RNA sequence: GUCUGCUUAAUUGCGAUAACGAACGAGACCUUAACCUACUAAAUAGUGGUGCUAGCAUUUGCUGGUUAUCCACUUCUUAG
RNA sequence: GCGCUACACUGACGGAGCCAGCGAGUCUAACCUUGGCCGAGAGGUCUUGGUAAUCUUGGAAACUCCGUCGUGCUGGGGAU
């Protein structure tokens, strides 16, 4: 039928994989939904998206987040940009076209990640020095 | 009759001679229309031989990082002891292995 | 204890050694057209309402 | 419904540790109170205790959570690194033993069985046993 | 920086003499027509002949 | 008498408005074009606020719209692009019926006879190609030297043959109208100072329009095929508009819109409002335009990112 | 007022306290403000961290430190003493409990009186290393009000650490014991005990 | 020729020039990290559907176990 | 000269959450070892797989958890 559509997630590493079919309710995150978050200090990142914007929305949209990569932190952006993305993916190929307009002018403000993942890449290394631009000792 | 679902292993030094063989692969097998897949294009091993410059301590610390890149390629093909034979003769080459680990 | 509270306008030109000091005109925010020209210490700009409680000396042009 | 996963990552630990601490059948191995279990820990378990009934709840939630694994897999995993002193510091692997017998004592009940490939697979009891006991350590939640 | 080259200027420059009427600022519209006139190595260096050009229809009209 | 009065606009794209359409079936049901790789289907309510709901984005090319051509039925829109094609999307959502594929240079077009089948596109290449409402080819014309600009439909009340006629265009400075069944060949127009960016139809099977790099719209027959009203418009025109049943043209000339009026020969009314903060070579100018199919709502389209439709209304 | 109900009960704690709401929903940044003029442009009264983490491109563009989030330039600073160097989550697992020990001691905004160790904590009046030969003066120049507050985090932090150092108070007690008495500041802190110890090697020299 | 000047990571380039046009270096090239919802295949990668199935709900649902129960897939994960 | 831990409550101790990536590896013989037992522990071993995306191998630490320690050279320090 199934109405389904869908997306990834990418920050630094891994990748999630947003399956966001017609059921009821649910957000299952690694075989645990988000209530149970994982390093449970940044927990809050991950909560700003179902409220960033009616938990209303989510209720119809329905997202099993599986999560590989990437040390634990890397991921929490890949799970966050992926809920929005698709967000847009659920407002760009099923629900309207200002709905992703009315939306990323909401998701668009903590201008932020999100919605565009991070451009920035662990430099080279080098011959001779240790973590980056490092010149080993100097003599005399 | 007797069928028999080969399956051909590649890798060279060159992206010329060797993509040039699953364009001739896979169409001089169509040609024969095998039931075959699409050039499968394996994870790109991939040796960095660090070494130091000079021929003597003397002299800064001043290095290199020479390696072959391979492109590991693989294929399919069924057809029985005549066709698949008159195909592993036939591409024939420079650069390039053929295996024919065959499946019986 | 008075302060003046002096906003800037014209940063100029670069001084020191080494480059510790820009020079700085100042508009006096609270009397605005008296435009003095004092020194600073930062990575400044115009706008950066400046503190000053040396009402004042006035400075000059540091090696 | 009523998920193991559904829950926490140290209520289930506690409230399957306290269920494994009073069930009495569980057997208990001669070398589990002293022997430091890892050797790069000097302090064996705070607990000298029914650690044995805490990883009787870990090993078990762990198994199910994937597929199979154990014994040298629980041999990567509980430990950590090194303390070797001054040497900068480095992984080492537990000791087989006492997670070679619960695992062969879970083998005993019906919660952990020998997945075919072979090594520890929970059965199919077991599971029954954790999906009870999942929804028992919600309600000290709920 | 950002500072201009020869092999580039001097490219703009004797293109500019001929073809200024095909002549644009949308470089995007040169960028293909840059390959049909020249003769060029890269594809790096032909976007950064056109850049120079747009910098003359930008300023002289 | 007819003062035309300025209105609200719709807004909304990223990149640059690059055609538009007169829907050719539901006239509503706005459907518009793109730059940046989309179609935002707009409604016209109409209400006031928004003059009237961006309810379908269409993704993507992989590159650059230069068209969107409605159907004979009018809810099957056509696209085009610089990355060699086309895909039909449906105005109603969201798909690809049948990707069209097989030029080498960039679509330049897209348009559909008056039964919705042999179409045709112009391309970089240097040709033309008929893809049947298949990724399929009649055949692949080859009669120009160059980058063929633009191809039209005419609209037919000799009430059809049914060997029928079309269009074309424009760097070796020509058109040339191709029987749309067996492409034969037909009449062209001679002249011209450089580029041909563009061309139009009647909305009956007895007017057209070519237009400019030089300045002058170089005026029709099809069915007198003979050269006719020759103006002058300084700029260029990128961006030709039939009212449908009034007698106004309507094309973006950088500066105006000259309506010139192909009736008598004059200058009624030119529209360059509206306008915040530019240095000239900033107009942001014009790239599509078009006359409510039922012909209006001039649904004057603008580089920027802002869509301007601006209907004639009352002395 | 509307509890959603979706199996998944994602709080309805912290569905009423966020959604009635934006915010950090512990503190509420919900008419507190800055009260003097300078210090406001360069100290973001926040953008909404609903908390207390941004990639962070904050030096590239020469300027946009002002743009970034006092509370994520301080977690930033903590960031040493060297050996958790790298660790910012054992620095808001720290000042996420420094917030709770202002609110709890006062009774105050703590959000606001951790903007008021901001401006009062700055020092104005500054020297400068004038070169100047072997021996010369630190010719005394209002340091832009941008460097000042760049010390106004730098100080509180080499003050406040020493206070755990052999020390039964765990920087949550001394960092909150120098803000409270850093702003009232007083001298039982460190800043207003070498802010002004600057001030007052300046009023000379000049 | 190999230069006053402006130019760059750079004798890197416009330009000034009894100096015209080339070689090496540098750069071009090779390694790897990123991207491809297009291709080519995968019981030494994983999906749903499928049973067999072990629990909570009983509301169809939710939580599983299964190197074959079968297949179908190839976003994923590998890699040409 | 090159270096390791530490002068703390922004930490030390502990349960309870509990997370990667670069490798490697036994053949003519002892390289990786689980699992399931024996050992407080360090380990012992039966036995197992693995010439390896096929086994040990999906569970590493900074941390979130829940707190005891309370400004006591300690409950920082870990020398001898």
Same mark, same amino acid.
């Given at each position: 039928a199934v109405p389904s559509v869908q997306t990834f997630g990418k920050k630094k590493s891994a990748t999630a994989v947003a399956h966001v079919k017609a059921g009821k309710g649910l957000i299952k995150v690694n075989g645990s939904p988000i209530t149970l978050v994982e390093p449970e200090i940044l927990a809050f990142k991950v909560y700003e998206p179902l409220l960033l914007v009616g938990l209303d929305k989510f209720s119809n949209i329905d997202i099993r987040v599986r999560v590989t990569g990437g040390g634990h932190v890397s991921q929490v952006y890949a799970i966050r940009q992926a809920i929005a993305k698709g967000l847009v993916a659920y407002h760009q %190929?099923?629900?309207?076209?200002? $709905? %992703?307009?009315?939306? %990323?002018?909401?998701?668009? $403000?903590?201008?932020?990640?999100?919605?565009?993942?991070? $451009?920035?890449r662990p430099e080279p290394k080098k011959f001779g020095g240790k973590g980056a631009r490092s010149r080993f000792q100097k003599s005399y | 009759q007797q069928i028999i679902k080969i399956r051909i292993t590649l890798t060279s030094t060159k992206v010329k001679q060797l993509e040039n063989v699953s364009s001739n692969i896979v169409k001089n097998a169509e040609q024969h229309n095998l039931v075959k897949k699409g050039p499968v294009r394996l994870p790109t091993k991939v040796l960095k031989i660090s070494t130091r410059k000079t021929p003597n301590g003397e002299g800064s610390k001043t290095w290199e990082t020479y390696e072959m890149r391979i492109h590991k390629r693989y294929i399919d093909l069924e057809a029985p002891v005549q066709i698949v034979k008159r195909i592993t003769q036939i591409t024939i080459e420079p650069g390039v292995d053929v295996e024919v680990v065959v499946a019986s | 204890?008075?302060? #003046?509270?002096?906003?800037?306008?014209?940063?100029?030109?670069?001084?020191?050694?080494?480059?510790?000091? #820009?020079?700085?005109?100042?508009?006096?925010?609270?009397?605005?057209?008296? #435009?003095?020209?004092?020194n600073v210490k930062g990575p400044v700009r115009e706008n950066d309402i400046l503190v000053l409680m040396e009402s004042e000396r006035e400075a000059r042009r540091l090696r | 419904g009523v998920s193991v996963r559904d829950v926490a990552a140290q209520d289930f630990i506690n409230a399957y540790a306290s269920f494994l601490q009073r069930q009495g059948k569980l057997e208990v191995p001669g070398y589990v109170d002293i022997v430091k279990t890892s050797s790069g820990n000097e302090m064996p378990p705070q607990d000298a205790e029914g650690w044995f009934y805490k990883r009787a709840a870990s090993v078990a939630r762990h198994i199910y959570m994937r597929k199979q694994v154990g014994v040298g897999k629980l041999n990567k995993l509980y430990g950590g690194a090194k303390s070797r002193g001054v040497r900068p510091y480095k992984h080492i692997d537990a000791s087989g033993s006492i997670n070679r017998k619960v695992l062969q004592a879970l083998e005993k009940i019906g919660i952990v069985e020998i997945s075919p490939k072979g090594g520890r697979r929970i059965s199919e009891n077991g599971q029954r046993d954790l999906d009870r006991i999942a929804a028992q350590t919600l309600e000290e939640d709920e | 920086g950002?500072?201009?080259?020869?092999?580039?200027?001097?490219?703009?420059?004797?293109?500019?003499?001929?073809?200024?009427?095909?002549?644009?600022?949308?470089?995007?519209?040169?960028?293909?027509?840059?390959?049909?006139?020249?003769?060029?190595?890269?594809?790096?260096?032909?976007?950064?002949?056109?850049?120079?050009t747009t910098h003359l229809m930008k300023r002289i009209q | 008498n007819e003062v035309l009065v300025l209105r609200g606009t719709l807004e909304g794209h990223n990149g640059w408005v690059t055609s538009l359409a007169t829907s050719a079936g539901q006239p509503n049901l706005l459907l518009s074009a793109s730059r940046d790789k989309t179609l935002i289907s707009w409604k016209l309510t109409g209400d006031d606020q928004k003059f009237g709901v961006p309810v379908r984005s269409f993704k993507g090319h992989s590159h650059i719209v230069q068209d969107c051509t409605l159907t004979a039925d009018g809810a099957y829109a056509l696209s085009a692009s610089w990355d060699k094609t086309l895909r039909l999307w449906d105005v109603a959502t969201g798909e690809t019926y049948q990707r069209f594929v097989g030029h080498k240079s960039?679509?330049?077009?897209?348009?559909?006879?008056?039964?919705?089948?042999?179409?045709? *596109?112009?391309?970089?290449?240097?040709?033309?190609?008929?893809?049947?409402?298949?990724?399929?080819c009649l055949a692949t014309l080859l009669g120009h030297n160059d980058w063929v600009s633009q191809v039209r439909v005419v609209p037919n009340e000799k009430a059809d043959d049914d060997s029928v006629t079309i269009i074309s265009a424009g760097n070796?400075?020509?058109?040339? =109208?191709?029987?749309?069944?067996?492409?034969?060949? /037909?009449?062209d127009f001679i002249g011209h100072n450089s580029n041909?960016? !563009?061309?139009?139809? *009647?909305?009956?099977?007895?007017?057209? =329009?070519?237009?400019?790099?030089?300045? /002058?719209?170089?005026?029709?027959?099809?069915?007198?095929?003979?050269?006719?009203?020759?103006? *002058?418009?300084?700029?260029?025109?990128?961006?030709?508009?039939?009212?449908?049943?009034?007698?106004?043209? @309507?094309? @973006? !000339?950088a500066t105006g819109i000259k309506v010139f009026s192909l009736d008598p020969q004059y200058l009624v009314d030119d529209l360059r409002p509206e306008f915040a903060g530019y240095s000239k070579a900033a107009e942001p100018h014009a790239v599509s335009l078009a006359w409510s199919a039922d012909g209006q709502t001039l649904f004057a389209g603008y580089t920027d990112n802002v869509i301007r439709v601006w209907q004639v209304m009352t002395a | 007022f509307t509890p959603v109900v979706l199996a998944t009960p994602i709080p309805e704690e912290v569905q009423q306290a966020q959604t009635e709401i934006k915010l950090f929903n512990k503190w509420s940044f919900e008419e507190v403000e800055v009260k003097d003029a300078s210090l406001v442009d360069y100290v973001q009264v926040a953008q909404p961290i609903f908390v207390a983490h941004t990639a962070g491109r904050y030096a590239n563009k020469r300027f946009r430190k002002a743009q970034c989030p006092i509370i994520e330039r301080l977690t930033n600073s903590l960031m040493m003493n060297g050996r958790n160097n790298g660790k910012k989550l054992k620095a808001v697992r720290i000042i996420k409990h420094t917030l709770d020990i202002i609110n709890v001691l006062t009774d105050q905004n703590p959000i606001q009186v951790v903007v008021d160790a901001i401006t009062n904590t700055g020092p104005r009046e500054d020297t400068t290393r004038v070169g100047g030969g072997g021996a010369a003066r630190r010719q005394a120049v209002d340091v832009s009000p941008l460097r000042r507050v760049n010390q106004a985090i730098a100080l509180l932090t080499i003050g406040?650490?020493?206070?755990?150092?052999?020390?039964?108070?765990?920087?949550?007690?001394?960092?909150?014991?120098?803000?409270?008495?850093?702003?009232?500041?007083?001298?039982?802190?460190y800043a207003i005990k070498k802010k002004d110890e600057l001030e007052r090697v300046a009023k000379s020299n000049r």
């Open positions: %190929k099923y629900v309207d076209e200002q $709905s %992703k307009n009315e939306l %990323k002018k909401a998701f668009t $403000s903590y201008d932020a990640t999100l919605l565009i993942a991070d $451009s920035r | - | 204890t008075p302060v #003046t509270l002096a906003k800037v306008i014209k940063v100029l030109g670069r001084t020191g050694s080494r480059g510790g000091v #820009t020079q700085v005109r100042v508009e006096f925010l609270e009397d605005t057209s008296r #435009t003095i020209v004092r | - | 950002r500072v201009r080259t020869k092999t580039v200027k001097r490219a703009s420059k004797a293109l500019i003499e001929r073809y200024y009427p095909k002549l644009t600022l949308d470089f995007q519209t040169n960028k293909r027509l840059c390959d049909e006139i020249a003769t060029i190595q890269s594809k790096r260096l032909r976007n950064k002949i056109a850049g120079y | 960039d679509v330049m077009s897209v348009d559909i006879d008056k039964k919705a089948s042999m179409i045709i *596109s112009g391309s970089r290449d240097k040709t033309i190609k008929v893809w049947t409402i298949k990724g399929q070796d400075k020509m058109v040339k =109208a191709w029987n749309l069944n067996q492409f034969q060949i /037909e009449a041909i960016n !563009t061309l139009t139809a *009647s909305p009956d099977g007895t007017l057209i =329009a070519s237009a400019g790099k030089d300045g /002058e719209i170089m005026l029709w027959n099809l069915a007198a095929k003979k050269a006719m009203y020759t103006l *002058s418009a300084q700029d260029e025109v990128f961006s030709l508009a039939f009212s449908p049943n009034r007698y106004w043209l @309507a094309a @973006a !000339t | 406040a650490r020493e206070a755990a150092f052999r020390n039964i108070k765990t920087i949550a007690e001394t960092l909150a014991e120098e803000l409270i008495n850093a702003a009232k500041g007083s001298s039982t802190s």
